[PDB]
Amino acid sequence: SMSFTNATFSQVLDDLSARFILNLPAEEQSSVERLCFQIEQAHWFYEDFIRAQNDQLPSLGLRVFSAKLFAHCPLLWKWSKVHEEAFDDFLRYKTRIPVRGAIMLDMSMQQCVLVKGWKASSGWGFPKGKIDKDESDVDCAIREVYEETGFDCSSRINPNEFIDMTIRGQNVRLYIIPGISLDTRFESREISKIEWHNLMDLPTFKKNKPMKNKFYMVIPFLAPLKKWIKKRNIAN
């Protein structure tokens, strides 16, 4: 889409407020938990879609974005100081579903492995999944990478190199694994395709660049990933 390419930040807050918050049934509006659900959905919508159309919009933490949204909408101002206190305690301290995955980079750290599902609405994304019971984070990442890409990363995954992100009510952690050979043959055991994507071709990675593709939960990680690659290059 192009609907937000020329939108101001205030217009974006208006769109998100009408899209996610304003028109809920009163039962949903009174509940703190439902309201957090909607704000998280709007936050993920902002990061994953709206920021892609316009990189002049800044990436915001869930707490900062939720604060700006609370200030923007006068209807939301019905919430009291004590109730915004307790609400921010819930959002900040809400237990979210843990999902773990990997960002697999080539030897030159210029391309990454992405997977796409069967549906036309299914977009490209990092291999990742929801953690099982009594499963460790690293084991969850290795398991999901094996199930989706068929690549065994247990000998190359680094438990101390990962990107944490709280988005769409999920605690996402993606372990960064560089040095993967482009000759790697990938196969799954429900994945439409596994492919290498150039990092600069991905939306918002380059400084000023235009290319229509659909991605899911990829744009939020590109700034930390870019930083990480710059540091690793600086070491080498």
Binding site: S1, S3, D15, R19, L22, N23, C73
Partner: protein
């Protein structure tokens, strides 16, 4: 309080007019609806990735239509209703034959919204 509804509708209309300049006013609103499409080749109903708030709007040209602000993706749904025979209320669903001969199924999460919106559409096309 009444003023809350005036401000709410004002912001709603500002957003819809931001996406669709020809929209003039909001006739009614449904909280949560799901959009299905009937596929001619499959001969079955399919669920579309469009979900969210339903706005029954009138545009400048006095045409009656609806915008659905998608909660799953930036792709909203904007369809017009031109003839009373192209909208039917079957069971808990509203089936609509669009201008391009497509068959859309609307499911309101609130059953009362279905009845109210359908009857106001009947009153809108006469």
């Amino acid at each position: 309080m009444e003023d809350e509804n005036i401000l709410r509708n004002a912001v709603n209309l500002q957003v819809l007019k931001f996406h669709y300049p020809e929209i003039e006013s909001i006739i009614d609103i449904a909280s949560h609806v799901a959009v299905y499409q009937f596929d001619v080749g499959s001969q079955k109903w399919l669920k579309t990735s469009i979900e969210g708030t339903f706005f029954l709007v009138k545009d400048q040209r006095a045409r009656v239509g609806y915008v659905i602000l998608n909660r799953n993706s930036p792709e909203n749904l904007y369809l017009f209703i031109n003839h009373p025979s192209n909208v039917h209320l079957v069971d808990r669903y509203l089936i609509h034959r669009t201008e391009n001969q497509h068959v859309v199924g609307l499911w309101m999460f609130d059953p009362n919204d279905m009845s109210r919106i359908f009857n106001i559409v009947k009153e809108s096309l006469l």
